[PDB]
Ligand binder design. Structure first.
Ligand SMILES: Nc1ncnc2c1ncn2[C@H]1C[C@H](O)[C@@H](COP(=O)(O)O)O1
Ligand SMILES: Nc1ncnc2c1ncn2[C@H]1C[C@H](O)[C@@H](COP(=O)(O)O)O1
Ligand SMILES: Nc1ncnc2c1ncn2[C@H]1C[C@H](O)[C@@H](COP(=O)(O)O)O1
Lengths: 524, 524, 524
């Protein structure tokens, strides 16, 4: 990739091509790149007991396309989800171009901008995965959903290890990575970048809700050939009757005692809250009794971490007054602030579909006897609040969302367990590589006599250009023998003043709701 | 398959062929097919709080061979289990034939039956697995163990999802499947059906009990090179002594403190009951305090489900007065009713063999400190009642029984854990397909003037014919260097009036006991 | 097609195969055939002034598959309509088989039925179209929607010409057709029939609603270069002002005066009625002032005929209290009678979608001046109630329904106009041929001495068998660049006691609502 100054170095492609069981999304967006940290690396750190962290902020920016709406349009996502029991990324190709480097000159009063033709910009992809991976933390920076929205490239920054739960102080293990210590490609207008990636083979995402329920997978018309204890006494009253060993053949209408082959999957109880302000308990944000303490969390090296997405568990409804972590929440259309007090201002996700295989988040997994029953003792009935893997469990994973993550890098650790990103998406060992970009520094007028001191005065600059990502998605059509019509993502937003999923009168594009994927159905 | 009326369309095969490490069981049985639901599909449903269920009952019947005694004879099962450390299904072939369709005519007083030559019967195999799988729920309907016992084909019926724990009401997800919306093969006498299947590669079943115990896998003659804390004080009395840090080299006779490499597998405590009526606690069947509540159970969408078979855990003995779920119970020889009060009337299974690797069902997994010990505090000793998977665990799975299930379909869910049917058997992703069969409807005399109303009057009919299943089993001979004789399944039923495992004087075949598989032994 | 008695002569096929842009529906149903008109042809006739008719009723039955639900399942129809901007029949193959002829014998008290092996049944297809075509009159007789519903074959009967509007009397033109004067194929059990047809090339059906409206097809941001008269005076008051010739450039916000290139298509005003009983006018059924008179109708040879389906016109809504002819009405799920008084008991169709191109049924086409305006005269503003074709008109045709007609034969007349069946469907010159079937007469015991008199005594008989139709449908996927999600046929029937679009607890299948086809959208 290399030509002249007055020659576009690439074209605008915003395809959409469906077929058999392959769909290829292609999209381009214009971007802007500032001069981060005024050209330098800055060591980050701040002791915040549990929020304690340390690291570094770099002068580099980076492209992030880890959000579904970066590739599919509303209509597409609809297509995709109303006719396919699953999908998955297969291949990706990214390309940056039409680089334009600008140098600003703030006048006596206001700023004036001009084209620095010979100025260069750098790009390079960490395809060896030797740098903290940031594109999968569910953070901002991905491309805009709306094709014609210009966006700012995010600043690259990474965290180191926090030794302790007190100080951000760093050990001899903490490491510093320098992006200049990498081979980068230098570009000027007329040059361009391009790269290709191939997704690892990964399981198709569900994209369907279950019909049958795990506890009702038998023939309602027939007896088991298995027997069990029905009751130890004769009455209808606890601890009172002639006392006997009553065994049953386990036949229809019973079912809750039918011997079964599979159990619901692992769960960890979550605290449930109400959207109606006065049904909660009045826990504060800050303080020694901050919400954190009362919400189910994990503990790493003395530090707390909300069990946020957490294990795949059946959740509350999107409409239900109850909600909780485990439920993804996105900003509403009219919500533009770091804070809100009106539930109706936000968007609530829901894993209600999982109630066919997984346990409910706020409830429990089941119950255990708290001791050994006797003729002179009925044991306490304990609560199975958290339960790990056990032979015979099966479960569904969290759904995927139109404005959700697409993939996440699996942690470089010997051993794990069922690698599905908890925020959702595809867990890859080596995922789409992070592409870094940064404007090259331009020394301003220099001293006329030598100085071993590093340069300070730099011309002020910023760049802009387009970028396009093309991902090949493998999808699988359904083919069920279900007779009755299925549920489907439909418009149904009724009459409206300014069409939904479209810019308003002021020219602002905003996403009305969150869209799932599990509309279609498959049995167990 | 297609010939004449006076020409058998198949022959009777009840082989048995052993060899190297392959055994092929072949068996045929005669069957009868009624006219279920008087030809129509009926929506099922009944709100029973926790036993709540919904679904449909179909006009179709189905062949089920998911029981070991359907294929092996007593003697065979014996052969199989006294010389092989394992086995597994490899291939299957089923064929239906000698179809005979009969039409009944109830006379003024009593019924008279005749042959409807031209009447047809339908068959088809759901080999795309697009229909609720029912053959693995441990229900009745499989073939009779006794070769010369005529059997009735089961009615096909399936359950939908239960949304809630209150109402059987159905949502837009519930689905209705219609078997007529499938390509079925129509037969008349002279026609026949046939099909072949190949089992997925699946782990051989154990078929052996362990010698060594997981906690005793070392050399009893030598010291470890590892050290540990033996005691914190000097006396023989708790909280009393000169208080010191006493470390040991961990040498013979100790063993319970030896550093080991593996832990017992996951477990969930089960309530234990006594067979002697007055040692229990007098819990009722029905009621707000039904046995269910007090027995360890799971909770799906607010509904309860006994943790019946549950996790592989060492169990009580077959003779022990204590028993519990986790133990398979079959009807005794003289037990002919949906209920019983005499333990000795039934047959108790037992996983006593697992006590070499798994934890005991009624007991616990182990113990944990309930807090941090101090010089001014000895923490509560907590009970590890339920424990999921943890790096380093190992365990044995539930045994297989002569009259037990053979396989079960693994649930269509992203992710599970160690897919061994909990009732026992082989967990296949796509198992032997369900073969459906139903008599074709025959309109009785019709109206002489048109009517857009669906037909009601149907000749009364039923069919009968033979069916044969052939399964190729892969088995592995032992080859241990064990010196002393091994345990073996022996007759030993002493003297008797009417030989056991044989019809009585009245001509009734009944199975005396339940037969396991783990008679042979292998170390760890 | 010819084999033995104990050999099925065909199998049961109820496929469904989707792909690129071709879908093949295959379905089979069991049927019953009586002995119509007790074996003879009967001349029909009845003078009913306007309902006057004449013709003949035949001893033959006939297969009719001219209803969409005969081929697609609920789910299919859904598939079909949520992803395709159109479809059309391409090829058809029908086959009858498993013929079973039964002879009844009513005993002293009640009837007894037996198999008459040697009895024959006749079939033949009028593929020369030389017989009144009846399969397209929107009458009963097609196959049941539910695969497992036995149905009665309809009786063939046809009408002749009615000369007059008084008498059913027939002229020398009236003709009598005899089906025995055709080559028919005789069958016995073991024989079978089969035939193939290929649809004529015919326009794909719409299957989409319009975005843009015919009167708003310009750029809302720009002026026309055309001028027009805006007002003849100065005030804001009719007939009052300084009187002038005010011409305008015809620019935005106006639009209703913009010069346009196309006009809405032809229409004929229909009378509108209200579903709320007391908003009508109290017109009687019978009488000299029967509803007919007051409802827009056509007049052929003095006879009246409701302008029922009539011209493609925008209609009322399915929910609107107003309804009218022009709107297809089907029986509700719980409606089982030739009459009803509760609108909510029935199912209302709606062409509301056509309001983007066609005029509204109950309203009018537009307005005309009733004379020539002058400085001393303002003409009556007339109502354009009925308007035929005029250069520049464009229009959409009536939608198609899940339980609607599929095709209709175009009348054998020199000339017509835009041949789209008014009830809806595909207008073919030579459509799927009518397949006739009738049981062959079997003389009962005969006289022992000759008689030139035609036979009377016939054994009583009826037959039954299966039939299957396979139609290859050509469909076209969409490919719009629409951004916002589209409307879609979704379940959404909320919670329910007995799942919809599925048999109830009593085993009765009933269709909940009527399903259209225009869910997707295309502009103009
Ligand atoms: N998103 C995603 N990525 C990878 N694997 C997934 C994912 N979702 C479910 N699984 C399953 C597929 C295999 O059973 C498995 C292997 O983990 P392993 O530790 O590699 O043996 O985890
Ligand atoms: N009956 C049966 N069927 C299948 N697998 C069994 C069974 N019994 C034990 N296992 C083991 C074999 C592999 O370790 C495994 C894979 O589960 P997967 O989720 O496929 O990675 O589970
Ligand atoms: N259903 C159907 N069948 C046939 N033609 C249709 C139909 N619907 C719309 N049209 C149009 C297609 C041509 O413009 C036409 C020819 O009529 P002709 O008199 O043959 O010149 O009518």
């Amino acid at each position: 990739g290399a030509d002249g100054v007055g020659n576009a170095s690439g074209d605008w492609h915003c395809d959409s091509t469906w077929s058999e069981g392959h769909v290829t999304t292609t999209s381009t967006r214009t971007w802007v790149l500032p001069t981060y940290n005024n050209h330098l690396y800055k060591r980050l750190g701040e002791s915040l007991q549990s929020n304690t962290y340390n690291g570094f902020s770099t002068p580099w920016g980076y492209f992030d396309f880890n959000r579904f709406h970066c590739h599919f349009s509303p209509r597409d996502w609809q297509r995709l989800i109303n006719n396919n029991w699953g999908m998955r990324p297969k291949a990706m190709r990214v390309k940056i171009f039409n680089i334009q480097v600008k140098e600003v000159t703030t006048s006596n009063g206001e700023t004036t901008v001009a084209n620095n033709l010979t100025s260069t910009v750098q790009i390079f992809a960490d395809s060896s995965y030797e740098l903290p991976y940031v594109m999968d933390a569910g953070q901002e920076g991905s491309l805009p959903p709306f094709p014609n929205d210009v966006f700012m490239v995010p600043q690259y920054g990474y965290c180191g290890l926090v030794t302790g739960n007190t100080s951000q102080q760093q050990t001899d293990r903490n490491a510093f990575y320098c992006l200049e210590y990498f081979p980068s490609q230098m570009l000027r207008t007329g040059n361009n970048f391009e790269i290709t990636y191939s997704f690892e083979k990964v399981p198709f995402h569900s994209m369907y809700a279950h019909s049958q329920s795990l506890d009702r997978l038998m023939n309602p018309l027939i007896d088991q050939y298995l027997w069990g204890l029905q009751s130890t006494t004769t009455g209808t009253t606890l601890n009172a009757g002639t006392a006997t060993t009553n065994f049953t053949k386990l036949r229809p209408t019973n079912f809750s005692n039918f011997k079964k082959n599979w159990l619901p999957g692992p769960s960890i109880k979550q605290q449930g809250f109400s959207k109606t302000a006065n049904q909660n308990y009045k826990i504060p944000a800050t303080g020694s009794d901050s919400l954190i303490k009362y919400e189910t969390h994990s503990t790493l090296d003395g530090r707390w971490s909300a069990l946020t997405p957490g294990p795949p568990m059946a959740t509350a409804g999107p409409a239900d007054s109850k909600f909780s972590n485990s439920q993804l929440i996105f900003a509403g259309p009219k919500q533009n602030g770091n804070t809100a007090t009106v539930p109706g201002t936000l968007i609530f996700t829901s894993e209600e579909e999982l109630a066919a295989t997984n346990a409910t988040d706020t409830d429990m997994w089941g119950n255990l006897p708290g001791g050994d029953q006797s003729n002179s003792n009925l044991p306490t009935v304990d609560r199975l609040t958290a339960l790990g893997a056990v032979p015979g469990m099966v479960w569904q994973n969290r759904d995927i969302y139109y404005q959700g993550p697409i993939w996440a890098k699996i942690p470089h650790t010997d051993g794990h367990f069922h690698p599905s990103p908890l925020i959702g998406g595809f867990g890859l060992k080596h995922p789409p590589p992070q592409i870094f970009i940064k404007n090259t520094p331009v020394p301003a007028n220099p001293a006329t006599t030598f100085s071993s001191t590093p340069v300070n005065s730099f011309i002020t600059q910023y760049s802009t250009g387009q970028v396009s990502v093309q991902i090949d998605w493998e999808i699988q059509k359904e083919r069920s023998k279900r007779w009755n019509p299925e549920v489907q993502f439909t418009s149904n937003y009724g009459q409206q003043n300014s069409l939904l999923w479209a810019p308003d009168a002021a020219g602002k594009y905003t996403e009305p709701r969150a869209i799932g994927t599990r509309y279609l159905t498959h049995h167990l």
